[PDB]
Each structure stands twice: as C-alpha cells, then as structure tokens.
Structure 1
C-alpha cells in the first residue's frame, strides 16, 4: 500500500514566517494528493487537491506543488488562523492513506 510520510512532524513558527511542509509517498501517486488543515477539536478541512488546486475560500498564501513521490505545501507569511495540524492524503487507487501529520505551533 502506499504510505505517506510527512516532515517535519512538528514545527514552531512565528506569525509572518513562510514555512514549507512535505509529504513523501512510498510509490508514485501521480499527483492525486490533497492537503487538509485540522484545528483543535474541529474536523479536517480541505485546503488543496490534485497537488496544486486550492479549495474555495482558501487564501492565496497557501500553495501546493509536487509530482511522483514528493509533494510540498508552502504557507507564505503565517497568520494566526493557520496554526494547527496539516495532513496529506492520496487518491491513487485504493487503499487511500493519510500522512502522519505536521503540527504547526506558534513560536515562543
């Protein structure tokens, strides 16, 4: 089955910083990759699908890229509402799997 590995597992960052988080697949998933953000106690929300397309109402400071087994979500100038957990998920055949998550926490 294709396994998704996300790095970093945890990232501390300040408001205004630009961060990039990656999602690596153990087999080619042919760009069928989506990103979700999950805030504390809330269900996951779709951010990006088919590698680069933003869902409705996602701010332009988010962008996804990738191909083959390597994908990245870049967030330019982090705003307070962006801290939380980020998950990638593939849709290449079945089973589908999720990466283990990256927790983005505000810097102190």
Structure 2
C-alpha cells in the first residue's frame, strides 16, 4: 500500500498570504492525486483532481502541481473562506489512501 504524508500538519497564516502544502507518496502514483478541503462540521469538498485540474467553482487562487511521489497544493493569497483542513488522496490502483491532513488556521 502506498501511503501519503502531508506536510506541514498545521500552518498558521494570515489572510492575503500565499501558502504551499505538500503531499508525498511512498510509491509512484502517476499523477492520480486529488485534493479536498474540509471545514468544521462539513464533509470534505473536492478542489483538484489529476494533480492540476480544478473542480468546477473552485477559485483559481488554488493550483496543484507534481509528479511521481511529490505533489503540491498552492494557495495564492488566502481568503477567510480558505481556513480548514486539506487532504490529498491517490487513485493509483487500490486500496486508495488519504494523507494525514494539513490544518490551515488563521494567525
């Protein structure tokens, strides 16, 4: 099984800052990577899939990149609406796994 490691586990940031979160795989997932955002008391919401494609309605301030075992999610100038938890998930064969999550909190 391929596991995903997310870093950092938590980040404090201000509105307007630019942040980058990482998802590293223990094996090659060949770009089958999705990113989800989860706010308090809500189910996760799809942001990005197949490494770089934004889901409908996701602000363009979000962008994903990566290949092999190294993937990244960049959020350009954070909006209040962006704080919450971020999860990466692979779709390479089965079983699927999620990274540990990155909690994004307001400084």
**Shorter-chain TM-score range:** over 0.9
2:81 aligned counterpart, secondary structure: helix
Q: How many residues align?
A: 107
In 2, Cα distance between equivalents of 1:63 and 1:106: 20
Runs of 4+ aligned residues of structure 1 deviating over 3 Å after TM superposition are none
C-alpha deviation, 1:43, in angstroms? 0.1
C-alpha deviation, 1:58, in angstroms? 0.1
C-alpha deviation, 1:62, in angstroms? 0.1
Q: Deviations over 1:31-82 (max 9, x none)?
A: 0000000000000000000000000000000000000000000000000000
In 1, Cα distance between equivalents of 2:60 and 2:27: 29
TM-score, length basis structure 2: 1.00
1:35 aligned counterpart, secondary structure: strand
Unpaired stretches in structure 1, ≥5 consecutive residues: none
Unpaired stretches in structure 2, ≥5 consecutive residues: none
TM-score, length basis structure 1: 0.99
In 2, Cα distance between equivalents of 1:45 and 1:10: 19
